[PDB]
């Protein structure tokens, strides 16, 4: 068992490499941008003709 | 009566502008307010002052 478990953990080690790589990939700081608009108005006056 | 023609003109014929004031009022400042009557109480806290 002392040798089998050691072999097993040594074989498991590489997978932790790509797992930590993916973890780091999840922390990549990226983003986009947002942009909006708006408009308000007001009548001034009016007369007949 | 022909002596009062210009006076009546400058009195009322130009005063129609004053009547034009109530027109814009009735048309916009009370008819466009149909939005305030349809909003929930959560929006009357702002629309009144707006």
Curated annotation (Swiss-Prot), chain A:
Signal peptide: none annotated. It is found in: Virion. Belongs to the Leviviricetes maturation protein family. The maturation protein is required for the typical attachment of the phage to the side of the bacterial F-pili. Binds to sequences located toward each end of the genome, hence circularizing it. The RNA genome-maturation protein A complex is released from the capsid upon host receptor binding. Maturation protein A enters the cell along with the viral RNA. Interacts with the host pilus. This is Maturation protein A. It comes from Pseudomonas phage PP7. The chain holds residues 202 to 250 of 449 of the full protein.
Swiss-Prot record, chain B:
It is found in: Virion. The maturation protein is required for the typical attachment of the phage to the side of the bacterial F-pili. Binds to sequences located toward each end of the genome, hence circularizing it. The RNA genome-maturation protein A complex is released from the capsid upon host receptor binding. Maturation protein A enters the cell along with the viral RNA. Interacts with the host pilus. Belongs to the Leviviricetes maturation protein family. This is Maturation protein A. It comes from Pseudomonas phage PP7. The lineage of its organism: Viruses, Riboviria, Orthornavirae, Lenarviricota, Leviviricetes.
């Amino acid at each position: 068992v002392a040798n089998g478990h050691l072999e097993l953990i040594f074989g498991w080690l590489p997978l932790i490499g790509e797992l930590e790589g993916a973890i780091e990939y999840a922390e990549l700081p990226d983003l986009d941008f947002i942009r909006c608009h708006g408009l308000h108005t007001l009548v001034l006056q009016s007369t007949p003709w | 009566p022909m002596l009062y023609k210009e006076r009546r003109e400058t009195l009322k014929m130009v005063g129609n502008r004053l009547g034009g004031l109530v027109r814009v009022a009735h048309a916009a400042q009370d008819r466009d307010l149909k939005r305030y009557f349809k909003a929930r109480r959560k929006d009357r806290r702002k629309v009144a002052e707006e």
